[PDB]
């Protein structure tokens, strides 16, 4: 079997109670659904099954899949489903299509993942009744995104942790987080981001407004600024608000078919996925992840560090992006060429989505013939994707 | 590529806010985890992978299905996520399973469903804030699993859509469902739940309990009790409490391995799984979704209706499952032959593993050769899998 | 002027979530004002206003005193309203009806107190929005009835800080705990409450439930069954929920008017009220209001101690009713002789005039001459009224 | 006796959500409390009782009146208590007061009102439990402030009830709430406001920022921008909210005592209490309220409507305000001579004391002898005082 990605397309990324703050996932995936289609030109018709990577569906009714998908335009008769495992889901999402097709039981899967944190609720268990005494309302987003269920603190401890290991002063992880911001404004105002973005319309009561740039960046972002900030987690700690990804809303999607496929369609794929992994770690230093997952896929597609010509690599907090390039060596100049999350932004269930499409369209516009996306995943995980251009 | 289901396990069904109403899913589903490695002889260090139907996750904390591996000691090295395909969740989660091990990405997965109805929480996105007058705290468990997402209604009404669709009496309804109750009643004194249960303990402050029986079942369940209901979702309409299944709480789990590994390791497995399907319908009408996807299922295994020997398919309402067995026209006398979900209860995101594994012990009891599991899901699709014993 | 006591009247007190759970104070309250006018053969259509203690309206509409006036028949043209001085409030209310008759702004009041503590909501302030982290909702009976807005904690406390300044062991407390038991079983079974208690009508879907009995009184207590209770404010304490009083429902009122309009009347009243006081004290010590309001009270009557011939005061904790009586040096045999809150309830809002209408009924029954009412208040205050009989 | 009113103060009116929606009501009224004894030269150890009129304690803790006496410095041996005849209260409490004293109870009260609508809790009942389904979070400003019990609709809607009986057209409540707004624009532009204002100061983490300005009243009010606006209680109504005051925060007291305690002390008193009243009128047309006790007051002081100097009258519905004047036939000249709620505010609570406030100011600077302050109440009442100058 040789599956290839046909197209793929991202929203904006979303600030927190930002542009997207009244948006539902579902909305913004139904968008980055019909933008794929669209962009190979399959109709919705001939799809299959829809996968998405969710990790924050509180609230938003029966398998928002399916919602995306048929306000898409997908018929009733394809079938879609969510998929949780953390920041991993919308990479995993990827590799589980792929799978769908390798099998013969799908011959085409829209694969990716859509998150609103701003709309996650909060809640609590209600039905045996509250005789009396205050009780807690949960923010499910902090509660179910942010939080390790062993520990019981913060993934910016999990940063901490992994921080204290790799000897990584408060200067490296700024430098770092300035790095990625620099990069980030060059991308958006060299037009480095329009290819992957589809435009979103947020329909509104006085007006539509339509949103095609990522509003997460920050422009003009100074090593003496990120110096100013207070740590965020650890009193006495590294990590704070400037070196660490924020909270963010939006979707990516990828169409997957076999290249056989996609040449009777006289498509030209963005790549071809050639192999991935995921591998568990310890959760108190899950930013670790990555390096055994990027390794395991690498000796999966049968391909040296050395060959990578580009990577992906999720910039969850500074300090574990430090340690994962050290640790693998590979060119600091060819790493999240256009910025990573600290600048752009982390919606969670998607974010695996959203680097997958800055990789495939920055190695399609210099040329490059093999790249690696990796992330690290909360309770300790790791999960990569090789990809060979055609 | 031949894949077998080496074990199987599940816990008692409780009743909603009953034997498990303060026990979380992730506890339930750690129960099972063990209790498929102990059955195989299969040490927790040797699972690649848990994979985890769940439906309803809000306040769980990050990944359950991480959560109930790391309590059933699977090693951090693992990894594990959940899905969510609602009430087929459970089944697919086993066939994603058995895709992992025949694309080479894995040796030993655990798959199946978990979920706590009585354990989901109220919610109300408040971020926003909410300048003036009242708002709604809406009940997860019937906004995330009983409401459909198009239409606005209750999956009762689809399953009224449907009596009327195929012109069933609440007179066959109520036959159907203390027949049900009367299948189950005799199995359970019969001792034919015993080896797919494994007992649960729930963990008190004055004592500790041992659930080890489904106690939703109701014993000497009459035609008139069924008779002197009122119609929960139509007032003119069929479908009662006691003719639809309930809310609760469960899991249940199968441990996937080549044929080749089961018979290294002196395995004799419960059945081979040697075809799957999943498709869409109406929504509308969507427990009709068993018929095509069995259909299809039957095609991909190169069988007839005819060839099977027994059937486990679902019973969410008598309408649909009335309807199921109309259409497909198999023996009624080799379906549900232990009861059904309207006697033993639908905890949704579970209720797949759960069918699947009366399946199995039942086929291993009798000597059935050919079986086949079926479910409708929410949103309107169906799925199922065909299983041969060895 | 002279001001007397024409008529009162009171429901039996209601145990938390017990035979009141579902009533709204006004309900009660109405119940109580028309007992009042039916006992002096006065008319609804004289009543010039109604004035209700309530310390707990949140959830209950626009003026439940007017509500509970309403539904009692008293017209339109008339006026009603609430306060708020806590446990203070319906013994407080009475004091403020008889200054409209001194003044000459009125000629009938009806007052007293009503108290709904089982429908009591919980709450949160949601307007500006809760960006990011959990928030409590807050048991507003906890909140606005039990906690010391200075310090934080619950009365409870304070009566540990009175058993500690006034040396009150744990087995003085207890032994006064099952003394108030046994005292208001023994009138209970004797009749002594059946004058004071008017009848209430609890309306259900399945019948009707009459309630004019006091719940919430234990009979058979025993010291052993105080004495193995655990102190429930302080882990090395002496206060327990044995020895406090409870939270409960009920409403109680009086009906007022000149001597003069009484005699034209040919009323036979229950009393004169000759003095009143109210004076603050430390909040730490809220448990000792009583003894400056009830000096401040008798050197207004021109009253000794000594000339008393019966004294209810309210016993929140045993510990400060104990410091009370030590203090004052009444002679313990006329005070609470047919028990008190301990073993009856303390509906706070209503207790002030619960307490009075148990004084006015047994110096009638007794023949006593002079009596005085009295009870501490939550942040610091006690207030005290002293009556006459004709 | 006669008591007259040594000093008085309020804050800034704020704006819903605006200037104090941080600001707990206690904290408004312990800075008005203060701010009386300033004025009147009058030390905070030698108050008796404070009195504030309070609508919305719901959340605030226990007694927010004395929470606010406390924190302005009145000692712990004085007394504080809440009362609520809803807008009357903070006028009424002033009658309370004056009869404290004039029955000998008391020598110095500081009385008013205090709210704040923007902190009002939104709440549940949820002791019982909340077994199944979505339940209702009530707004306690809607349900305690605004919706009449009765009937069950806002007090909008007895706006309308009384436009209809009186014949109202749209055409002349706009052109009154623009005139109401012209006014209120001018006098506070001309610094008429400063002298009964007292400054609040709203601490900040990043920076205090004092408030000393009515912030309600629009600036350049236009009749075109009345006459656009939609009716916001029936559909082919007539009162908007242009034509309706609003939801708002803020505190107002005076300080009371004995003539002859003024004289001993040399204080040159605001004005002489010299008649109040309050009666019921039907809750449907509840905003006719101040007629029958404008006259009953008129009547109990001696005078004739037209021996008036000075007239306060608030303003909650144009509708009602112009149906008062019509019936009642002053001189609309001397009515609102500085604006009134419709441009101001209306604090529910506090209003009473505001217009007091707003009286006893304009009284003083233009010689004014004789003037009256009333109100309409929920419920259906009104109140009305009485003022002459010394
Ligand atoms: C495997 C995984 O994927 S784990 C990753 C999952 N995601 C996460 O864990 C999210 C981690 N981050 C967070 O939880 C949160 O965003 C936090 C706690 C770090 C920050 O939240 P907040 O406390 O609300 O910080 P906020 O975004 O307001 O920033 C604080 C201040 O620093 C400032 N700031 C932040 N970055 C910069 C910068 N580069 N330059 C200058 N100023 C900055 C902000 O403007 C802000 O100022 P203000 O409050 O006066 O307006
Ligand atoms: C894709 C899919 O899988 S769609 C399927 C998903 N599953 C569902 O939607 C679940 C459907 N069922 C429901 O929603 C609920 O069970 C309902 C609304 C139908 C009824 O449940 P509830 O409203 O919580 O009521 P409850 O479970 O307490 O039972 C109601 C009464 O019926 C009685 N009852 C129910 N069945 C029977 C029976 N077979 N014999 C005798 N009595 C019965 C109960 O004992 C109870 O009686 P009571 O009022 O005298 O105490
Ligand atoms: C000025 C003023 O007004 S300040 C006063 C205001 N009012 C108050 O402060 C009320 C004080 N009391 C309270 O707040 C509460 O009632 C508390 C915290 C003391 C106890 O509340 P709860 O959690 O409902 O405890 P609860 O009433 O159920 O009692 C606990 C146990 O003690 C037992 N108990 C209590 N009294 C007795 C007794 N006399 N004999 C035997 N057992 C007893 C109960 O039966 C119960 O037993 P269980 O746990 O085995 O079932
Ligand atoms: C006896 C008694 O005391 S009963 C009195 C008790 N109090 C009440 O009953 C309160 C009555 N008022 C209310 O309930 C509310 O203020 C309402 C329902 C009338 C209006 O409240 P809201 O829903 O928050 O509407 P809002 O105040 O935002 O006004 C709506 C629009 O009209 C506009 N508007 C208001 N006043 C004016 C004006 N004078 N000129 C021009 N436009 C105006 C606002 O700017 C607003 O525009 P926007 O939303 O595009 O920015």
């Given at each position: 079997p040789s599956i290839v990605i046909a197209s793929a397309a991202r929203?904006?990324?979303?600030?927190?109670?930002?542009?997207?703050?009244?948006?539902?996932?579902?909305?913004?995936?139904?968008?980055?659904?019909?933008?794929?289609?669209?962009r190979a030109g399959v109709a919705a018709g001939e799809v299959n099954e829809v996968i998405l990577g969710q990790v924050l569906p509180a609230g938003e009714g029966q398998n928002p899949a399916r919602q995306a998908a048929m306000k898409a335009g997908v018929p009733q008769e394809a079938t879609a489903w969510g998929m949780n495992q953390l920041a991993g889901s919308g990479l995993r999402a990827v590799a589980l299509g792929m799978?769908?097709?390798?099998?013969?039981?799908?011959?085409?899967?829209?694969?990716?993942?859509?998150?609103?944190?701003?709309?996650?609720?909060?809640?609590?268990?209600?039905?045996?009744?509250?005789?009396?005494?205050?009780?807690k309302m949960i923010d499910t987003m902090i509660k179910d995104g942010l939080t390790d269920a062993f520990y019981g603190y913060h993934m910016g401890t999990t940063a901490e942790n992994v921080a204290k290991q790799w000897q990584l002063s408060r200067d490296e992880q700024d430098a770092f987080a300035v790095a990625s911001q620099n990069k980030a404004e060059a991308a958006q105002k060299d037009g480095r981001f329009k290819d992957e973005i589809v435009?979103?319309?947020?329909?509104?009561?006085?007006?539509?407004?339509?949103?095609?740039?990522?509003?997460?960046?920050?422009?003009?972002?100074?090593?003496?600024?990120?110096?100013?900030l207070?740590?965020?987690?650890?009193?006495?700690?590294?990590?704070?608000?400037?070196?660490?990804?924020?909270?963010?809303?939006?979707?990516?999607?990828?169409?997957?078919?076999?290249?056989?496929?996609?040449?009777?369609?006289?498509?030209?794929?963005?790549?071809?996925?050639?192999?991935?992994?995921?591998?568990?770690?310890?959760?108190?230093?899950?930013?670790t992840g990555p390096i055994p997952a990027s390794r395991k896929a690498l000796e999966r597609a049968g391909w040296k560090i050395g060959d990578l010509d580009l990577v992906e690599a999720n910039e969850a907090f500074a300090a574990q992006a430090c340690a994962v390039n050290k640790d693998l060596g590979?060119?600091?100049?060819?790493?999240?060429?256009?910025?990573?999350?600290?600048?752009?932004?982390?919606?969670?269930?998607?974010?695996?989505?959203?680097?997958?499409?800055?990789?495939?369209?920055?190695?399609?516009?210099?040329?490059?013939?093999?790249?690696?996306?990796?992330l690290c995943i909360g309770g300790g995980m790791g999960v990569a994707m090789c990809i060979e251009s055609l």
């Open positions: 929203t904006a990324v979303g600030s927190f109670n930002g542009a997207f703050a009244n948006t539902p996932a579902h909305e913004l995936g139904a968008t980055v659904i019909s933008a794929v289609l669209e799978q769908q097709i390798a099998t013969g039981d799908a011959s085409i899967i829209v694969a990716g993942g859509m998150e609103s944190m701003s709309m996650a609720p909060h809640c609590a268990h209600l039905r045996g009744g509250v005789k009396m005494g205050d009780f435009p979103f319309i947020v329909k509104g009561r006085k007006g539509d407004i339509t949103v095609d740039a990522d509003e997460y960046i920050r422009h003009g972002a100074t090593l003496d600024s990120m110096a100013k207070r740590p965020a987690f650890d009193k006495e700690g590294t990590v704070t608000a400037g070196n660490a990804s924020g909270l963010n809303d939006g979707a990516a999607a990828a169409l997957l078919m076999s290249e056989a496929e996609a040449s009777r369609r006289g498509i030209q794929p963005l790549g071809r996925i050639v192999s991935w992994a995921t591998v568990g770690v310890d959760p108190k230093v899950m930013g590979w060119d600091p100049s060819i790493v999240n060429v256009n910025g990573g999350a600290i600048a752009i932004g982390h919606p969670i269930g998607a974010s695996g989505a959203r680097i997958l499409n800055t990789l495939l369209f920055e190695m399609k516009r210099r040329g490059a013939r093999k790249g690696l996306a990796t």
